[PDB]
Design a protein around this ligand. Structure first.
Ligand code: HEM
Length: 137
């Protein structure tokens, strides 16, 4: 289930975080625009940069903490608020977050692993309405 998936993901965090983020950026190249330093680079060039790994690991770790704190795949309103208000998410809309979750789910379905891909979809949908409720366009 969903709680075991957090343990799995977390077992090899930096590896999953970069694989999932690459799948997001290649599914939706328009989104790369938000990541000016990553433009013009192949997957392997990105994975060779320390700062790519460091940044994905940090995002993913926070995502796993938000997932951990959820109840039945509904995140806490305060976690959503942390997400809306961080400086770093200044120009974003809820559309950027739903694209991310589509790629996550699609990555999970395609991997070998017994992820509970349906719980992750539902989590992403409930995150997106929580983000809206906390002030995001
Ligand atoms: C639940 C999903 C997400 C979480 C937990 C999250 C969290 C974070 C965190 C913790 C950072 C700062 C990392 C650091 O200090 O190096 C960050 C940065 C950033 N995030 Fe997110 N984020 C999420 C989704 C997104 C999405 C969907 C976008 C855009 C599509 C996005 C765009 C950015 C950008 C552009 C930065 C700045 C990176 C930099 O300037 O180095 N984030 N996010």
């Amino acid at each position: 289930g969903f709680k075991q998936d957090i343990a799995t993901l977390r077992g090899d965090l930096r590896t999953y975080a970069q694989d999932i983020f690459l799948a997001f950026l290649n599914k939706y190249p328009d989104e790369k625009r938000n990541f000016k330093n990553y433009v013009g680079k192949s997957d392997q060039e990105l994975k060779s940069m320390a700062k790519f790994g460091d940044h994905t690991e940090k995002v993913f770790n926070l995502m796993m903490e938000v997932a951990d704190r959820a109840t039945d795949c509904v995140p806490l309103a305060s976690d959503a608020s942390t997400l809306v208000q961080m400086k770093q998410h200044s120009g974003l809309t809820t559309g950027n977050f739903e694209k991310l979750f589509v790629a996550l789910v699609e990555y999970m379905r395609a991997s070998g692993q017994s992820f509970d891909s349906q719980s992750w979809d539902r989590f992403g949908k409930n995150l997106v309405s929580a983000l809206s409720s906390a002030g995001m366009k």
